């Protein structure tokens, strides 16, 4: 149920079995054809003033490092880091940018996969 998923998302410490789920979610995003702008950090020499404007940069390779290192204690923290990728992209870029489009598509995919992860955890 949505009740159980919400409670577990905020309160339930991530287990090793949860981490196998988080690796599956991250690998599914890295394989998505619209992940191409998010696999590595933004190149400063491509994106003028990016690191002056975006205060909390994030990318899928940094998320992979944090997952491998068992950085996250709560799913909320994993979701907050992932959400930076999409929010940062939509903030820095105009709405007609290919990067902006990729953020919209990959976030919708992540939201589908996250809901699946939560359900699998609640069962
Ligand atoms: C998310 C993101 C982003 N991620 C990203 C990461 C890597 C690669 S990469 O193919 O590996 N590679 C591309 C070539 N570099 C020399 C090396 C890197 C491509 C990427 F798109 N790249 C850029 C690049 C440029 C801009 C930009 C530049 N000006 N503006 C206007 C708003 C002022 C936007 C935004 N960007 C982003 O937002």
mmCIF file of C-alpha atoms and ligand atoms in Angstrom:
data_model
loop_
_atom_site.group_PDB
_atom_site.id
_atom_site.type_symbol
_atom_site.label_atom_id
_atom_site.label_comp_id
_atom_site.label_asym_id
_atom_site.label_seq_id
_atom_site.Cartn_x
_atom_site.Cartn_y
_atom_site.Cartn_z
ATOM 1 C CA UNK A 1 0.000 0.000 0.000
ATOM 2 C CA UNK A 2 0.996 3.695 -0.499
ATOM 3 C CA UNK A 3 0.770 4.110 3.333
ATOM 4 C CA UNK A 4 3.460 1.401 3.928
ATOM 5 C CA UNK A 5 5.699 2.682 1.025
ATOM 6 C CA UNK A 6 5.632 6.307 2.356
ATOM 7 C CA UNK A 7 6.401 5.240 5.980
ATOM 8 C CA UNK A 8 9.234 2.898 4.879
ATOM 9 C CA UNK A 9 10.664 5.565 2.495
ATOM 10 C CA UNK A 10 11.077 8.102 5.384
ATOM 11 C CA UNK A 11 11.859 5.759 8.343
ATOM 12 C CA UNK A 12 13.144 2.278 7.348
ATOM 13 C CA UNK A 13 16.975 2.043 7.264
ATOM 14 C CA UNK A 14 18.278 0.731 3.921
ATOM 15 C CA UNK A 15 19.303 -2.953 4.142
ATOM 16 C CA UNK A 16 21.830 -4.802 1.916
ATOM 17 C CA UNK A 17 18.759 -6.250 0.072
ATOM 18 C CA UNK A 18 17.533 -2.623 -0.428
ATOM 19 C CA UNK A 19 20.966 -1.767 -1.909
ATOM 20 C CA UNK A 20 20.656 -4.580 -4.505
ATOM 21 C CA UNK A 21 17.351 -2.830 -5.471
ATOM 22 C CA UNK A 22 19.066 0.610 -5.596
ATOM 23 C CA UNK A 23 21.843 -0.807 -7.873
ATOM 24 C CA UNK A 24 19.114 -2.219 -10.194
ATOM 25 C CA UNK A 25 17.337 1.218 -10.301
ATOM 26 C CA UNK A 26 20.649 3.095 -10.991
ATOM 27 C CA UNK A 27 21.758 0.608 -13.740
ATOM 28 C CA UNK A 28 18.287 0.942 -15.436
ATOM 29 C CA UNK A 29 18.774 4.763 -15.522
ATOM 30 C CA UNK A 30 22.393 4.493 -16.809
ATOM 31 C CA UNK A 31 21.094 2.230 -19.679
ATOM 32 C CA UNK A 32 18.250 4.649 -20.682
ATOM 33 C CA UNK A 33 18.851 6.311 -24.073
ATOM 34 C CA UNK A 34 17.967 9.760 -22.523
ATOM 35 C CA UNK A 35 20.608 9.349 -19.711
ATOM 36 C CA UNK A 36 23.404 10.536 -22.075
ATOM 37 C CA UNK A 37 23.750 14.030 -20.411
ATOM 38 C CA UNK A 38 23.777 12.633 -16.821
ATOM 39 C CA UNK A 39 26.343 9.724 -16.887
ATOM 40 C CA UNK A 40 29.257 11.953 -15.756
ATOM 41 C CA UNK A 41 29.545 15.431 -14.199
ATOM 42 C CA UNK A 42 28.723 18.486 -16.338
ATOM 43 C CA UNK A 43 31.909 19.632 -18.195
ATOM 44 C CA UNK A 44 32.600 23.196 -16.926
ATOM 45 C CA UNK A 45 34.285 23.987 -20.294
ATOM 46 C CA UNK A 46 30.922 23.094 -22.001
ATOM 47 C CA UNK A 47 28.619 24.966 -19.532
ATOM 48 C CA UNK A 48 29.683 28.534 -18.676
ATOM 49 C CA UNK A 49 29.563 29.372 -14.920
ATOM 50 C CA UNK A 50 27.819 25.980 -14.251
ATOM 51 C CA UNK A 51 29.649 25.431 -10.911
ATOM 52 C CA UNK A 52 28.945 29.046 -9.788
ATOM 53 C CA UNK A 53 25.172 28.697 -10.537
ATOM 54 C CA UNK A 54 24.464 25.058 -9.508
ATOM 55 C CA UNK A 55 25.277 24.841 -5.780
ATOM 56 C CA UNK A 56 24.729 21.029 -5.404
ATOM 57 C CA UNK A 57 25.853 19.334 -8.645
ATOM 58 C CA UNK A 58 25.052 15.624 -9.076
ATOM 59 C CA UNK A 59 25.368 12.968 -11.833
ATOM 60 C CA UNK A 60 24.747 9.184 -12.126
ATOM 61 C CA UNK A 61 28.526 8.280 -11.725
ATOM 62 C CA UNK A 62 28.644 10.169 -8.386
ATOM 63 C CA UNK A 63 25.402 8.363 -7.384
ATOM 64 C CA UNK A 64 27.041 5.030 -8.407
ATOM 65 C CA UNK A 65 30.085 5.826 -6.173
ATOM 66 C CA UNK A 66 27.719 6.724 -3.244
ATOM 67 C CA UNK A 67 25.679 3.496 -3.764
ATOM 68 C CA UNK A 68 28.877 1.334 -3.900
ATOM 69 C CA UNK A 69 30.145 3.102 -0.687
ATOM 70 C CA UNK A 70 26.745 2.537 1.122
ATOM 71 C CA UNK A 71 26.494 6.343 1.544
ATOM 72 C CA UNK A 72 22.640 6.316 1.930
ATOM 73 C CA UNK A 73 20.862 5.345 5.233
ATOM 74 C CA UNK A 74 17.313 6.262 4.029
ATOM 75 C CA UNK A 75 15.615 6.046 0.610
ATOM 76 C CA UNK A 76 14.639 9.783 0.972
ATOM 77 C CA UNK A 77 18.428 10.625 0.743
ATOM 78 C CA UNK A 78 18.891 8.531 -2.442
ATOM 79 C CA UNK A 79 15.795 10.168 -4.027
ATOM 80 C CA UNK A 80 16.998 13.674 -2.963
ATOM 81 C CA UNK A 81 20.427 13.161 -4.677
ATOM 82 C CA UNK A 82 18.776 11.761 -7.841
ATOM 83 C CA UNK A 83 16.292 14.689 -7.934
ATOM 84 C CA UNK A 84 19.247 17.193 -7.912
ATOM 85 C CA UNK A 85 20.310 15.803 -11.352
ATOM 86 C CA UNK A 86 16.933 16.698 -12.944
ATOM 87 C CA UNK A 87 16.286 19.940 -10.941
ATOM 88 C CA UNK A 88 19.834 21.223 -11.634
ATOM 89 C CA UNK A 89 19.422 20.493 -15.368
ATOM 90 C CA UNK A 90 16.029 22.251 -15.637
ATOM 91 C CA UNK A 91 17.351 25.253 -13.601
ATOM 92 C CA UNK A 92 20.534 25.852 -15.647
ATOM 93 C CA UNK A 93 19.028 25.184 -19.127
ATOM 94 C CA UNK A 94 16.172 26.743 -21.098
ATOM 95 C CA UNK A 95 12.995 24.605 -21.463
ATOM 96 C CA UNK A 96 13.730 24.031 -25.239
ATOM 97 C CA UNK A 97 17.222 22.532 -24.540
ATOM 98 C CA UNK A 98 17.854 18.834 -25.419
ATOM 99 C CA UNK A 99 19.318 18.581 -21.862
ATOM 100 C CA UNK A 100 16.007 19.885 -20.360
ATOM 101 C CA UNK A 101 14.035 17.297 -22.442
ATOM 102 C CA UNK A 102 16.341 14.492 -21.188
ATOM 103 C CA UNK A 103 15.734 15.585 -17.532
ATOM 104 C CA UNK A 104 11.917 15.393 -18.079
ATOM 105 C CA UNK A 105 12.064 11.930 -19.700
ATOM 106 C CA UNK A 106 14.636 10.371 -17.360
ATOM 107 C CA UNK A 107 12.893 11.735 -14.236
ATOM 108 C CA UNK A 108 9.542 10.187 -15.435
ATOM 109 C CA UNK A 109 11.411 6.851 -15.895
ATOM 110 C CA UNK A 110 13.093 7.154 -12.456
ATOM 111 C CA UNK A 111 9.662 7.899 -10.865
ATOM 112 C CA UNK A 112 8.262 4.661 -12.481
ATOM 113 C CA UNK A 113 11.296 2.597 -11.300
ATOM 114 C CA UNK A 114 11.268 4.210 -7.784
ATOM 115 C CA UNK A 115 7.553 3.333 -7.309
ATOM 116 C CA UNK A 116 8.428 -0.257 -8.326
ATOM 117 C CA UNK A 117 11.347 -0.352 -5.842
ATOM 118 C CA UNK A 118 9.061 0.916 -3.012
ATOM 119 C CA UNK A 119 6.400 -1.734 -3.816
ATOM 120 C CA UNK A 120 9.048 -4.546 -3.865
ATOM 121 C CA UNK A 121 10.370 -3.341 -0.504
ATOM 122 C CA UNK A 122 6.796 -3.231 1.045
ATOM 123 C CA UNK A 123 5.942 -6.896 0.115
HETATM 124 C C1 LIG B 1 23.515 18.172 -17.887
HETATM 125 C C2 LIG B 1 24.379 18.931 -18.869
HETATM 126 C C3 LIG B 1 25.457 18.337 -19.565
HETATM 127 N N1 LIG B 1 25.800 17.023 -19.348
HETATM 128 C C4 LIG B 1 26.720 16.271 -20.082
HETATM 129 C C5 LIG B 1 27.772 15.569 -19.475
HETATM 130 C C6 LIG B 1 28.680 14.907 -20.287
HETATM 131 C C7 LIG B 1 28.521 14.904 -21.669
HETATM 132 S S1 LIG B 1 29.716 14.126 -22.710
HETATM 133 O O1 LIG B 1 29.094 13.733 -23.943
HETATM 134 O O2 LIG B 1 30.442 13.186 -21.914
HETATM 135 N N2 LIG B 1 30.758 15.334 -23.104
HETATM 136 C C8 LIG B 1 30.301 16.352 -24.061
HETATM 137 C C9 LIG B 1 31.514 17.060 -24.641
HETATM 138 N N3 LIG B 1 32.362 17.633 -23.595
HETATM 139 C C10 LIG B 1 33.514 18.319 -24.186
HETATM 140 C C11 LIG B 1 32.781 16.580 -22.661
HETATM 141 C C12 LIG B 1 31.574 15.922 -22.029
HETATM 142 C C13 LIG B 1 27.494 15.603 -22.278
HETATM 143 C C14 LIG B 1 26.637 16.292 -21.462
HETATM 144 F F1 LIG B 1 25.611 16.927 -22.054
HETATM 145 N N4 LIG B 1 26.224 19.036 -20.436
HETATM 146 C C15 LIG B 1 25.934 20.301 -20.676
HETATM 147 C C16 LIG B 1 26.705 21.030 -21.623
HETATM 148 C C17 LIG B 1 26.430 22.357 -21.900
HETATM 149 C C18 LIG B 1 25.366 23.012 -21.264
HETATM 150 C C19 LIG B 1 25.090 24.422 -21.579
HETATM 151 C C20 LIG B 1 25.963 25.384 -22.130
HETATM 152 N N5 LIG B 1 25.387 26.587 -22.241
HETATM 153 N N6 LIG B 1 24.111 26.391 -21.825
HETATM 154 C C21 LIG B 1 23.158 27.457 -21.708
HETATM 155 C C22 LIG B 1 22.353 27.582 -20.460
HETATM 156 C C23 LIG B 1 23.460 28.546 -20.739
HETATM 157 C C24 LIG B 1 23.901 25.088 -21.402
HETATM 158 C C25 LIG B 1 24.603 22.341 -20.300
HETATM 159 N N7 LIG B 1 24.911 20.972 -20.028
HETATM 160 C C26 LIG B 1 24.087 20.254 -19.075
HETATM 161 O O3 LIG B 1 23.204 20.857 -18.461
#
